[PDB]
């Protein structure tokens, strides 16, 4: 086709093919145009489950929160006996919901 | 993007570590699926081809 050297002196608009490992026999599954990708009718079989694209971006349900010693918002108290917080009740009859926090003693 | 020795090595290590399950995205170049590297290639991988790069 057209031969054209870029500022790097290299050929552009090269045609690339896409192959897939289907039981260890290569199968043509797509092509790459000069600037476009044209998949064929062959199925996209993946190592895992569906032929659809697996969203390989994991998530988490355990957040590691950091906070600082703020006098009216974040109070610090040593545990009573072992990792336990004294269940003090407010003047309104509402128990104080505490949380087990791990931090250094001093600077 | 590496040599075929490195490709076979990492395929063997990943097969030992079982990282070829569902959700894994695999994408390799042309140099990575030739020689003995093709031998250790986990199934379901995607490869590219240089058209008429050898004729």
């Amino acid at each position: 086709g057209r031969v054209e050297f870029n500022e790097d002196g290299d050929r552009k608009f090269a045609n690339y093919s896409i192959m897939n490992l289907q039981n260890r026999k290569l199968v043509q599954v797509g092509i790459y145009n000069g600037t476009h990708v044209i998949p064929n009718d062959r199925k996209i079989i993946w190592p895992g489950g569906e032929t659809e694209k697996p969203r390989g971006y994991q998530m988490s349900t355990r957040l590691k929160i950091v906070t600082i010693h703020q006098e009216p918002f974040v109070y610090v108290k040593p545990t009573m006996s072992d990792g336990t917080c004294k269940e003090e009740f407010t003047v309104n009859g509402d128990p104080v919901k505490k949380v087990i926090c791990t931090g250094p003693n001093d600077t | 993007s590496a040599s075929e020795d490195d490709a076979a090595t990492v395929y063997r290590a990943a097969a030992m570590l079982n990282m070829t399950g569902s959700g894994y995205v695999w994408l390799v170049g042309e140099r990575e699926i030739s020689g003995n590297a093709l031998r250790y290639a986990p199934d379901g991988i995607i490869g590219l081809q240089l058209i008429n790069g050898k004729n």
Partner: antibody
Amino acid sequence: QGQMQQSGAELVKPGASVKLSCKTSGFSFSTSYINWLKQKPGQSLEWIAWIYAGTDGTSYNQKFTDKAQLTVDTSSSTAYMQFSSLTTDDSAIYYCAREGIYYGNYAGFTYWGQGTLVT
Amino acid sequence: DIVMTQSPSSLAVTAGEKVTMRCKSSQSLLWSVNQNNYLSWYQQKQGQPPKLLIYGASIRESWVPDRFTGSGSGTDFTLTISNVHAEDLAVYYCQHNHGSFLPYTFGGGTKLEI
């Protein structure tokens, strides 16, 4: 239609080496798979090795991994099998065949050479 | 190597009759994910390269007449000819095509006589 032509008959001394040729034509030489099979007379064919021309990927039978070597020439689209340390057990007919693949799924050997007898 | 068992070893019949040839693999050639049998039936005549007859243990080739019928699944397979002709006289081999079950092996073979 694709054609695969093999080399002629060979008389080789025991312990010596032979290198057989298999010219291929009529199809995409680079994007197909070629297999060498050993068939003794009156016996079924024994798979020796397969090679992919597009990537030079080679895989041999364990019985012939240390005995046979495969090479290809893209300019001539000809397959090569070099059999070394030949013994009287190697007195047999060797064939080269092209794999038939449909919809990306291999369906068997669809093309064959004429066969070569090594004595 | 998966052991391919072919039965009968040979048979002789008159033209127009119906024959049956069985193929048994030592292992299941069916892959569960796609439910396809990696079995191929072939027709091999004297002095000629073998001609691919039936693949997948059930699908005839385009050149294969409807008289040929391949059946069986899993480990056991069967090749059946409803109307036997003289031209069909050949040695038929069943061979596995399962890539995960390398190397490719062949059965004992069945010789057809008329």
